[PDB]
Every structure is written in structure tokens, then in C-alpha cells.
Design a protein around this ligand. Structure first.
Ligand SMILES: Nc1ncnc2c1ncn2[C@@H]1O[C@H](COP(=O)(O)O)[C@@H](O)[C@H]1O
Length: 585
């Protein structure tokens, strides 16, 4: 009903006003519920909280923690401990974060109830968008949504990414008919374990219903960029399926075949049109040509994903890029209340019902005083930067997420945050988040191949190259040759693979499982290249004694400068090794 939908939207927006006005009280209430329900859990009992639920005591008693501090408890639960270790409710599963510890995905505990809070955040997005872009209930959204690799812990609990867990839950699979969540992709195309068949069926379903499409997207920019690349490679096969009304024999999954069968009909004119647009040399504006009623591209382009803004603007011909929410495996955080703002102006308003949020000022061990005086959600100051600290319903207490956020403004009393970065992350193409330490150790393993040739790496840096789809990590190497035997290309290709083999499981899964990352490249640079970069820094006030070559570079003019001094480049000849789950298991 049009009246019931408008009433529902108005109530969700009034909920936002209520919780942003009474933000500190909602925060107080959330922490009280977490601490009363889990009063008798081992973690809080051993720290002496003694069933006290007040905020003042919690901040004085409980320590601020990293994943490594609580890994003993997490591993015990993963090995089968069903007692109340971190939570009074049973841990339903582990949500495997893209952030890693010891090169393995961090295991974030969750409880069945947490899906109600994830569904609450998702329920606020269309009521917010509807204010700015009306009429979205009269069409469909073409979203490319994917389930990723799953595994089981030794104790039998599922270990899977938060999005795979949500799509497989009844909150998404058995969701009620909402015209605002009417997607072109049937649930069976999303819930398909074969990534190729999932992408192929979703792209075909998207093309079959192209006139009904009012918005396009994916969770992340990289994933949507890959869907466009998939169409670049398979549009002749896909147009054939439209013309004949028969799905490709490569789609062997019977559940996908039945779901696609209820949409796919023979349509030679649509096939001719799809062929005519894709045949064109320039794909600038292919999204608006194939899906002409698209109002915006809905992908996250904040954080590392901002490197994709030029590619997305090319394929969309400058349609608005919309960043709707900020979330993690450990906790869903906030929504963007200005979805039509410019990507550089995006701020996320944290919803105080999700978790009890705390803020560590930034300008790593924390002093007793610093842990005690962590800033509450409503007390953060405009323009100041903070690390996000979270206390969740699923057994995390004063957990450092590692995200650095800046205060852009306030919605009533609730702060709005610009996303700065995930601390220490230097390279990323899709979900992979390679930190400076993983990279340094991967390069240290690779330079052992140069030792028999009496060669050494004088200096190196890196950047994430998005000139190709899927993107790849690029390493710039400057060698010091002290021997007489020239180094053959196979040795440098062995270095490329040795780096890849030492990178974390998310990087290696990206190369092996979903093909979201391309082969790593080592670009050799002329002698004196890194001394020329040092000359740029010395001119800008850097000392010779304090200068160290950065391990990673993002600023395009410096990447261009290094690329201009390249002699030869080498690529990894094969994928690194990868299998689902932790190597220990
Ligand atoms: N809207 C967003 N903009 C920028 N970074 C984001 C956004 N949403 C999630 N992230 C990052 O991804 C992390 C969660 O990764 P994961 O736990 O694998 O889902 C967050 O803590 C952020 O660092």
C-alpha cells in the first residue's frame, strides 16, 4: 500500500531523530543491557565487574583490547568451549573479518540476535534515500551480491563472512515483499557457491529486466567494477541467451537454472540492443545506455575504495556515487544521512542502538589514564580524529576496531564521521587489507632468491594498481648487483610468487577463489631512482638522517615518477596457495 509505505518511511526517519537526539541515553541503555545480560560471563567475572552495569565502573575496570588480547577466549570457543566465556547467549558462528592476525582472518563472535540489529540498520537506508530520490519503490535495483567461501571451526561452529551469513539467513532469504528491496537478482543466483555462475546469472537477470532498473550497485566499488568487466568479457554469450531464451550450458547449478528460467524469455530485439551498446569501442556511459533509468551507482567509495571513483565515473558518465553505510564483521556502525553528497564529503552517523561506542583520540599500548578517559559518542569534538572502540552484544568489550574517524558534524547530538583509514593498511584491491608489516616480511622472504646471485634490494616501495580489472599490487624494486651471473626472469617471477605466498589469506583467497586480485608485479627501476625520491623529500624539508623510503605510495605524481624510471617488470606466474579456514585447522 502507498499509504502504508509512506507511513513506514516516516516512522523510520522519526526513529533516526529520536535516537540521534537521545544518543547518550541510548548509549547508556545499550551498555546496561550488554552488562546485565552477560553479568555472569567468564571474561567480565575474572575482571571483577561483579554484575555492575554502570558506565563509570565499566570504563575504570575493563581494559581496552586488541584482537590478540582476546584471542585465547575466541580460540577456546572455536575449539568447542560452549560455556559462557564472552557471552551468555550461545555463539552461533564466527564472522570472518577481512582484517587479519598472523595472516589469518580474525574470527569475530556473533549471536543469532545480532541479525535483528543488522536488519535494523538496513531498514533505515531506503527511508533516508527516498527523501532525496523519490519513486524507487516503482522499479528494481540491480545489485551484484555474492556469497564467499565458508569453513567450520574444530568445535563445529560455522566460520563465514558477515555478508554470506546475512544472505543465507531468513532475514534476507525469507524476507517479506518490500518494493524498495525488489532486486533483479533472484536469491538463488546470490546464494550460488560457484562465483562464475553467480556473476553470469545475475548479469543476465540484470540485462533481462534493464528497463525496470532505477539504481545499480554492489557492497564495494571493486565488486561492481568486476561485474562491468564480466559484461566486457561475456556480453556476446549473454546476448545469445537473451535472443534464444536458453541459458548457457556452463550454468550447471539446477537452483540457478530454475530461478533464471522464471525471468529469461527469447527477446531478439533486446539481444540486438545489448550487442549494439557493448560493441562500441568506448564504454564511457555503458551503465546509462544499458540501464537507461538508473538514478545512481550505490557502492562504497570511502576509504581505500575511493581509488575506483574515476573508473566508476567513466562507466556511469558521472552518475551520483552513493555510500549508504559503514559496517564491520564485529559490529554494524552507521548510515550516511546525505547520500547524494560528493564522495569526499561523506560522513556516517553512528546509530547508538548498534553497540556501546567509545573513542580514543589520535595525534600501540594505552596508559591506564587513556583507557579510563575514552571519549563517549556524544562528547567527541568537531575536526578531531579518533580510533573507534566498540562494546557489542556478541562478547566484545572495549575492542579496538582499528578504524580512524574524523568528526565532520552532528545530527542532533549524534556525531557524523568522515572515514580516514583502517590503521596500518597500506595496500588493497578488494576485501584484502595488507598491512605494512605483512608486506615488509613478504619482501624479506622474496629477497632470499637474490642471495645466490650476490644481489640485494637497495630500496623498495609499493602501490595498488587499478589500471587493469581486477587490480593488482605493484612493487618497485631497485637492485644492488655485486656478482657476475645475470639474474634470469624466472628468478624475479619466483620473487613475485614468494611475496604472494607470504601475504595474508584474504589476499591469497582474492587471487584463487573469486579472482578479485590479479598477479602481483615487480617493477625494476633504474639505479638512483629511490635517491631521486629522497631528493624530492630533502627539498620539502626532510633530513638525510631521518628519511626512510615509504613502504607504500598512493599519491599519483610519485607513482608516475617511479613508473617513468621502470626498466623491466615481472609478474607472478601462478596463484599463491589457499584453502578455506585457518591453516591450524
Ligand atoms: N563505508 C565504508 N567506508 C570505508 N571503509 C569501510 C566502510 N565499510 C566498511 N569499511 C572498512 O571495512 C572494515 C570491515 O571489514 P570486514 O570486517 O571484513 O567487514 C571496517 O572496519 C572499515 O575499515
Amino acid at each position: 500500500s502507498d499509504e502504508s509505505l509512506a507511513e513506514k518511511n516516516k516512522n523510520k526517519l522519526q526513529f533516526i531523530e529520536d535516537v540521534t537526539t537521545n544518543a547518550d541515553d541510548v548509549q547508556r541503555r545499550v551498555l546496561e543491557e550488554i552488562l546485565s545480560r552477560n553479568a555472569d560471563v567468564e571474561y567480565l567475572k575474572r575482571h571483577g565487574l561483579e554484575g555492575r552495569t554502570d558506565r563509570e565502573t565499566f570504563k575504570h575496570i575493563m581494559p581496552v583490547v586488541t584482537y590478540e588480547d582476546i584471542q585465547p577466549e575466541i580460540n577456546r570457543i572455536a575449539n568447542g568451549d560452549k560455556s559462557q566465556v564472552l557471552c551468555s547467549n550461545p555463539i552461533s558462528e564466527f564472522l570472518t573479518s577481512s582484517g587479519t592476525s598472523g595472516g589469518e582472518r580474525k574470527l569475530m563472535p556473533t549471536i543469532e540476535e545480532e541479525l535483528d540489529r543488522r536488519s535494523l540498520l538496513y531498514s533505515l537506508l531506503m527511508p533516508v534515500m527516498d527523501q532525496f530520490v523519490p519513486g524507487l519503490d516503482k522499479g528494481k535495483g540491480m545489485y551484484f551480491l555474492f556469497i564467499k567461501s565458508e569453513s567450520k571451526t574444530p568445535g563445529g561452529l560455522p566460520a563465514r563472512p558477515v555478508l554470506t551469513s546475512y544472505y543465507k539467513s531468513s532475514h534476507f532469504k525469507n524476507r517479506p515483499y518490500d518494493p524498495y528491496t525488489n532486486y533483479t537478482s533472484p536469491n538463488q543466483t546470490i546464494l550460488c557457491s560457484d562465483s562464475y555462475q553467480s556473476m553470469y546469472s545475475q548479469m543476465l537477470c540484470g540485462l533481462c529486466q534493464h528497463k525496470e532498473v532505477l539504481r545499480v550497485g554492489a557492497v564495494f566499488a571493486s565488486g561492481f567494477i568486476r561485474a562491468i568487466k564480466f559484461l566486457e568479457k561475456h556480453w556476446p554469450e549473454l546476448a545469445r541467451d537473451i535472443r534464444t531464451g536458453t541459458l548457457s550450458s556452463e550454468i550447471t547449478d539446477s537452483s540457478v537454472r530454475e530461478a533464471v528460467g522464471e525471468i529469461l524469455k527469447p527477446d531478439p530485439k533486446l539481444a540486438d540492443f545489448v550487442e549494439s551498446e557493448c560493441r562500441k569501442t568506448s564504454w564511457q556511459g555503458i551503465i546509462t545506455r544499458l540501464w537507461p533509468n538508473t538514478k545512481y551507482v550505490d557502492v562504497i567509495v570511502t576509504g581505500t575504495m575511493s581509488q575506483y571513483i574515476p573508473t566508476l565515473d567513466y562507466y556511469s558518465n558521472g552518475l551520483p556515487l552513493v555510500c549508504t553505510m559503514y559496517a564491520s564483521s564485529e559490529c554494524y556502525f552507521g548510515v550516511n544521512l546525505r547520500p547524494l553528497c560528493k564522495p569526499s564529503e561523506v560522513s556516517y552517523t553512528l546509530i547508538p542502538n548498534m553497540a556501546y561506542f567509545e573513542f580514543l583520540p589520535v595525534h600501540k599500548a594505552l596508559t591506564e589514564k587513556e583507557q579510563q578517559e575514552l571519549v563517549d559518542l556524544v562528547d567527541v569534538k568537531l575536526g578531531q580524529e579518533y580510533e573507534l572502540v566498540v562494546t557489542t552484544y556478541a562478547g566484545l568489550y572495549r575492542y579496538r576496531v582499528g578504524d580512524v574517524l574524523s568528526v565532520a558534524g552532528f545530527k542532533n547530538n549524534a556525531p557524523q564521521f568522515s572515514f580516514i583509514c583502517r590503521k596500518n593498511v597500506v595496500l588493497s584491491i578488494d576485501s584484502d587489507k595488507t598491512d605494512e608489516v605483512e608486506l615488509q616480511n613478504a619482501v624479506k622472504n622474496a629477497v632470499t632468491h637474490l642471495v645466490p646471485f650476490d644481489a640485494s634490494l637497495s630500496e623498495y616501495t609499493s602501490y595498488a594498481d587499478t589500471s587493469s580489472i581486477p587490480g593488482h599490487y605493484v612493487l618497485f624494486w631497485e637492485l644492488c648487483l655485486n656478482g657476475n651471473t645475470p639474474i634470469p626472469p624466472s628468478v624475479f617471477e619466483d620473487c613475485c610468487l614468494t611475496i604472494e605466498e607470504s601475504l595474508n589469506s584474504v589476499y591469497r583467497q582474492g587471487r584463487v577463489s573469486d579472482k578479485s586480485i590479479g598477479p602481483l608485479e615487480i617493477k625494476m627501476v633504474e639505479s638512483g631512482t629511490f635517491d631521486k625520491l629522497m631528493d624530492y623529500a630533502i627539498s620539502l624539508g626532510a633530513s638525510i638522517n631521518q628519511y626512510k623510503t615509504p613502504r607504500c605510495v598512493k599519491f599519483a605524481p610519485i607513482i608516475e615518477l617511479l613508473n617513468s624510471r621502470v626498466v623491466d617488470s615481472y609478474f607472478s606466474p601462478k596463484c599463491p596457495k589457499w584453502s578455506p579456514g585457518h591453516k591450524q585447522w
